[PDB]
C-alpha cells in the first residue's frame, strides 16, 4: 500500500548486435459490459449486408496490445535502426504490470467522489496455450500510445465465431474467460511475464540496387539464342522465315533469365488527384476482393506488390497499400489530406507493380491462317523460379501476426507486414474483479446485478530484445539515409505542438539502405 511495485524504464540500449527497447506507460481500465458476457451480432450493431454479417461475444475483459512499432521505438531509435541495419527481428519479450490502484467512483448528488479501494483486486491472465481467439494482429486500436507522456485506456476483448448471417451455426463456440486461471492483484502486487520468440526470418530492411531483369554483364553477349525474326524483312513480298539472335547488351529484354518476379493479384489504380479518376462509385465495385463462403471481402492490403512505376507518385493501388491516419483524423469519409498513404515502390526490382498486368501469355496456336494471340495475366500464383520481397514495416504499423492454425500455409509472412509467428506473444487479458453492492437481507436465488462502480489504473512496461543484422555495404558512393529535413519549420517533427499534442507527420518505413540482388 505504501510502497511502489516497480520503476519507470522507458529507454533503448544498443549493444552492437542487438537492441533492447523498454517502454513504460500508464493505463486505465473501466468495467466493460458491466461485468457481463453479451452475445453480439451484425443485427445488434444495427444490421448490415451479408458481407458484413457477424456473430461473436463481448466480454468484460480488456487486453493489452503493444503490437505496433511505435510503442517500442522512438522516432530517433527507429532512424538509428533504419539507417544502419540490414535486417532485424525480435528475440525475447518481457511484460510487467505494476503500481496498481483500484479507484472506486461513487456518484452521489451530482458530486463525483473517487476514492481508492485498497482491498479490491483485478484479474490478469495470459493465454500461453492459445486456447482463446487471437485478436491481436488485426491492426486494431488501443495500443500503448507512441508518446510516453500520455495515458491510455485498455480496449475491450470480444471475439467472433462462425455465423450464417446474424445467426450462430452448430460449430459456433462460446469461450468463458473466467474459466482460465487468472491472478488476482491488489494494490501492492505486480504481474511479471516473460516470452521468447521462435526463430523467424530477419525483416529485410534494405532496398535492392539491381532490378531482377537486369542482372547481366552489359558488356558481354550470351551464348544462347532466341527467335529474333519471323518474317523475311522487306523485298516487297516478305514471307515466313526463322531468324535467331544472341541476347546482347542492346537486347537486354530478349536475353535469357533464370528468375521471375514475385506473384501478383492485380489492383485498381486510383490517383491522389481526384480529377484524374473516373466519376463513379467504384470503391467497392472496382475493388479486388476474395470470396469466402459466399461473402466477399476486400483484399487489403493484399499480397506484396510495388505501388507504381517510375515517375508516377500520384497513383496508388486502391487497396494495395497501408493507409495510416494523421493525428486526430476522424473515422469516416475523411479526405486525403487527413491520411498518409504508404509508398511500396522500393520493391519494383523484384515485385510486379500492383496496378499492372503480371505478364502476357499465348492464348492459341499460331498457324498459316491463325495468327499469334496473347492474353494479359492479372492474377499469377507462384511458380518455380519466382523471387519476391515482403511488405515493409512502418514505425506506425504492426509487428507480428499469429499464423493461423491450419495444415497448410505458403510463406506465412503477414500481408500487412511484420513477422508471422505460430506462437506469437500471448494475449494479456485483464479485468476488474466485481465487487457487489449491499445484498438483500433475505435470500434471493437471483445473481447479484448491483455492483460498486470502480476502475483501475497503474503502469505497464514492455521490454523487447531485437536482434540486428548490421550493414556491411562495400558500395563506394553515399547511401540514402532517413533524415529530418534541415529547413526551418514552425514546429519540430515528431514533437509536441504548442498544446501538448504529439504527432507523427509521416509514415516511416525501413527500406533505406540498398543492397545488390
Ligand X SMILES: CO[C@H]1O[C@H](COS(=O)(=O)O)[C@@H](O[C@@H]2O[C@@H](C(=O)O)[C@@H](O[C@H]3O[C@H](COS(=O)(=O)O)[C@@H](O[C@@H]4O[C@H](C(=O)O)[C@@H](O[C@H]5O[C@H](COS(=O)(=O)O)[C@@H](O)[C@H](O)[C@H]5NS(=O)(=O)O)[C@H](O)[C@H]4O)[C@H](OS(=O)(=O)O)[C@H]3NS(=O)(=O)O)[C@H](O)[C@H]2OS(=O)(=O)O)[C@H](O)[C@H]1NS(=O)(=O)O
**Binding footprint of ligand X on the chain (CB under 6 A):** 364-365, 367, 370
How far apart are the C-alpha atoms of 399 and 313, rounded to whole Å?
27
**Which among 88-96, 206-214, 230-238, 439-447 is the span making contact with a second copy, rule CB under 8 A?**
439-447
Are 244 and 225 in contact by the 8 Å Cβ rule? The answer is: yes
Which C-beta is closer to a second copy: that of 7 or that of 473?
A: 7
Instruction: Based on the shown chain and the rule CB under 8 A, indicate whether residue 133 belongs to the binding site for a second copy.
Output: no
Report the alpha-carbon angle 478-481-483, nearest 5. 130
- The one of a second copy, ligand X, none whose footprint includes residue 512, by CB under 5 to 8 A per kind, is none
Contacting residue, 47, 243, 249, 439, with a second copy by CB under 8 A: 439
Instruction: Based on the shown chain and the rule CB under 8 A, indicate whether residue 189 belongs to the binding site for a second copy.
Output: yes
Contacting residue, 2, 234, 235, 294, with a second copy by CB under 8 A: 2
- The one of ligand X, a second copy, none whose footprint includes residue 179, by CB under 5 to 8 A per kind, is a second copy
Site string for a second copy, 31-60 (x = CB under 8 A): xx-x--------------------------
Which C-beta is closer to a second copy: that of 171 or that of 474?
A: 171
State how far Cα 63 lies from the chain centre: 18
- Cell numbers at residue 476, please? 563506394
Least distance to a second copy, CB of residue 54, Å = 18
- Cell numbers at residue 284, please? 467497392
φ/ψ of residue 138, rounded to 5: -110, 10
Which C-beta is closer to a second copy: that of 73 or that of 419?
A: 73
- The one of a second copy, ligand X, none whose footprint includes residue 367, by CB under 5 to 8 A per kind, is ligand X
How far apart are the C-alpha atoms of 497 and 503, rounded to whole Å?
8
Q: If we measure between CA atoms, which residue out of 365, 351, 261 comes closest to residue 306?
A: 351
Is 92 exposed, middle or buried, given 0-12, 13-18 or 19+ CB atoms closer than 10 A?
A: middle
φ/ψ of residue 202, rounded to 5: -60, 150
How far apart are the C-alpha atoms of 343 and 306, rounded to whole Å?
8
Please list, residue by residue across 430-465, b when 16 or more beta carbons sit within 10 angstroms of its beta carbon and e when fewer do: bbbbebeeeeeeeeeeeeeeeebbbbbbbbbbbbbb
- The one of ligand X, a second copy, none whose footprint includes residue 185, by CB under 5 to 8 A per kind, is a second copy
Instruction: Based on the shown chain and the rule CB under 8 A, indicate whether residue 254 belongs to the binding site for a second copy.
Output: no
Residues 362-391 that bind a second copy (CB under 8 A): none
Which C-beta is closer to a second copy: that of 95 or that of 125?
A: 125
Instruction: Based on the shown chain and the rule CB under 8 A, indicate whether residue 176 belongs to the binding site for a second copy.
Output: yes
Q: If we measure between CA atoms, which residue out of 422, 465, 426, 469 comes closest to residue 200?
A: 422
Contacting residue, 48, 156, 161, 183, with a second copy by CB under 8 A: 183
Contacting residue, 187, 319, 350, 514, with a second copy by CB under 8 A: 187
- The one of ligand X, a second copy, none whose footprint includes residue 370, by CB under 5 to 8 A per kind, is ligand X
Please name every residue paired with 18 in a beta bridge, in sequence order, or none if there are none: 467
Which C-beta is closer to a second copy: that of 10 or that of 386?
A: 10
Which C-beta is closer to a second copy: that of 280 or that of 444?
A: 444
**Which among 145-153, 180-188, 281-289, 348-356 is the span making contact with a second copy, rule CB under 8 A?**
180-188
- The one of ligand X, a second copy, none whose footprint includes residue 4, by CB under 5 to 8 A per kind, is a second copy
Least distance to a second copy, CB of residue 177, Å = 10
For 104-152, the three-class secondary structure string (H helix, E strand, C coil) is EEEEECCEEEEEECCCCCEEEEEECCCCCCCCCCCCCCCECCCCCCCCE
How far apart are the C-alpha atoms of 284 and 299, rounded to whole Å?
11
Instruction: Based on the shown chain and the rule CB under 8 A, indicate whether residue 456 belongs to the binding site for a second copy.
Output: no
Count, residues near a second copy per rule CB under 8 A? 53
Which C-beta is closer to ligand X: that of 219 or that of 365?
A: 365
How far apart are the C-alpha atoms of 278 and 249, rounded to whole Å?
41
φ/ψ of residue 179, rounded to 5: -95, 15
How far apart are the C-alpha atoms of 287 and 176, rounded to whole Å?
38
- The one of ligand X, a second copy, none whose footprint includes residue 144, by CB under 5 to 8 A per kind, is none
- Residue 62 CB contacts under 8 Å (≥ 6 apart), including other chains: 29, 30, 32, 154, 155, 156, 157, 429, 430, 431
Handedness of CA 276, 281, 285, 289 (dihedral sign): positive
Residue number with the shortest CB distance to ligand X?
365
Which C-beta is closer to ligand X: that of 15 or that of 365?
A: 365
Which C-beta is closer to ligand X: that of 370 or that of 488?
A: 370
Residues 83-102 that bind a second copy (CB under 8 A): 83-84, 99, 101
φ/ψ of residue 225, rounded to 5: -95, 165
- The one of a second copy, ligand X, none whose footprint includes residue 152, by CB under 5 to 8 A per kind, is none
Least distance to ligand X, CB of residue 365, Å = 4
| Residues near a second copy, by CB under 8 A | 1-4, 6-11, 16, 26, 28-32, 34, 74, 83-84, 99, 101, 103, 118-121, 123, 125, 176, 178-189, 433-436, 438-441, 448, 452
Amino acid at each position: 500500500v505504501g510502497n511502489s511495485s516497480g520503476n519507470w524504464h522507458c529507454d533503448s540500449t544498443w549493444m552492437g548486435d542487438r537492441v533492447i527497447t523498454t517502454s513504460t506507460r500508464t493505463w486505465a481500465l473501466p468495467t466493460y459490459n458491466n461485468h457481463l458476457y453479451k452475445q453480439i451480432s451484425n443485427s445488434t450493431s444495427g444490421g448490415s449486408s451479408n458481407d458484413n454479417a457477424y456473430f461473436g461475444y463481448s466480454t468484460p475483459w480488456g487486453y493489452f496490445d503493444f503490437n505496433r512499432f511505435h510503442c517500442h521505438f522512438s522516432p530517433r531509435d527507429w532512424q538509428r535502426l533504419i539507417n544502419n541495419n540490414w535486417g532485424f527481428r525480435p528475440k525475447r519479450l518481457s511484460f510487467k504490470l505494476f503500481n496498481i490502484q483500484v479507484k472506486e467512483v461513487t456518484q452521489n448528488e451530482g458530486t463525483k467522489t473517487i476514492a481508492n479501494n485498497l482491498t479490491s483486486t483485478i484479474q490478469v491472465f495470459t493465454d500461453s496455450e492459445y486456447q482463446l481467439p487471437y485478436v491481436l494482429g488485426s491492426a486494431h486500436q488501443g495500443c500503448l500510445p507512441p508518446f510516453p507522456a500520455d495515458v491510455f485506456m485498455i480496449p475491450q476483448y470480444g471475439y467472433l465465431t462462425l455465423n450464417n448471417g446474424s445467426q450462430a451455426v452448430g460449430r459456433s463456440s462460446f469461450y468463458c474467460l473466467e474459466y482460465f486461471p487468472s491472478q488476482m492483484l491488489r494494490t501492492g502486487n505486480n504481474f511479471q511475464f516473460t516470452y521468447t520468440f521462435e526463430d523467424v526470418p530477419f525483416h529485410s530492411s534494405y532496398a535492392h540496387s539491381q532490378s531482377l531483369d537486369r542482372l547481366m554483364n552489359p558488356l558481354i553477349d550470351q551464348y544462347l539464342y532466341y527467335l529474333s525474326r519471323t518474317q523475311t524483312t522487306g523485298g516487297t513480298t516478305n514471307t515466313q522465315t526463322l531468324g535467331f539472335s544472341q541476347g546482347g547488351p542492346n537486347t537486354m529484354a530478349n536475353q535469357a533469365k533464370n528468375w521471375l518476379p514475385g506473384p501478383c493479384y492485380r489492383q485498381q489504380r486510383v490517383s491522389k488527384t481526384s480529377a484524374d479518376n473516373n466519376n463513379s462509385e467504384y470503391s467497392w465495385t472496382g475493388a479486388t476482393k476474395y470470396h469466402l463462403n459466399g461473402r466477399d471481402s476486400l483484399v487489403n492490403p493484399g499480397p506484396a506488390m510495388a505501388s507504381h512505376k517510375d515517375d508516377e507518385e500520384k497513383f496508388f493501388p486502391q487497396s494495395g497499400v497501408l493507409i495510416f491516419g494523421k493525428q486526430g483524423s476522424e473515422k469516416t469519409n475523411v479526405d486525403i489530406e487527413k491520411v498518409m498513404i504508404t509508398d511500396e515502390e522500393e520493391i519494383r526490382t523484384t515485385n510486379p507493380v500492383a496496378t499492372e498486368q503480371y505478364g502476357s501469355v499465348s492464348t492459341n496456336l499460331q498457324r498459316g491462317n491463325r495468327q499469334a494471340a496473347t492474353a494479359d495475366v492479372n492474377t499469377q500464383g507462384v511458380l518455380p523460379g519466382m523471387v519476391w520481397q515482403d511488405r515493409d514495416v512502418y514505425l506506425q504499423g504492426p509487428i507480428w501476426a499469429k499464423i493461423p492454425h491450419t495444415d497448410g500455409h505458403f510463406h506465412p509472412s503477414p500481408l500487412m507486414g511484420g513477422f508471422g509467428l505460430k506462437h506469437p506473444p500471448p494475449q494479456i487479458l485483464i479485468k476488474n474483479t466485481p465487487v457487489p453492492a449491499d445484498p438483500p437481507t433475505t435470500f434471493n436465488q437471483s445473481k447479484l446485478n448491483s455492483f460498486i462502480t470502480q476502475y483501475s489504473t497503474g503502469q505497464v512496461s514492455v521490454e523487447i530484445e531485437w536482434e540486428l543484422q548490421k550493414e556491411n555495404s562495400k558500395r563506394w558512393n553515399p547511401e540514402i539515409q532517413y533524415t529530418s529535413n534541415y529547413y526551418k519549420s514552425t514546429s519540430v517533427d515528431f514533437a509536441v505542438n504548442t498544446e501538448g499534442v504529439y504527432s507523427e507527420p509521416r509514415p516511416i518505413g525501413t527500406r533505406y539502405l540498398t543492397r545488390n540482388l
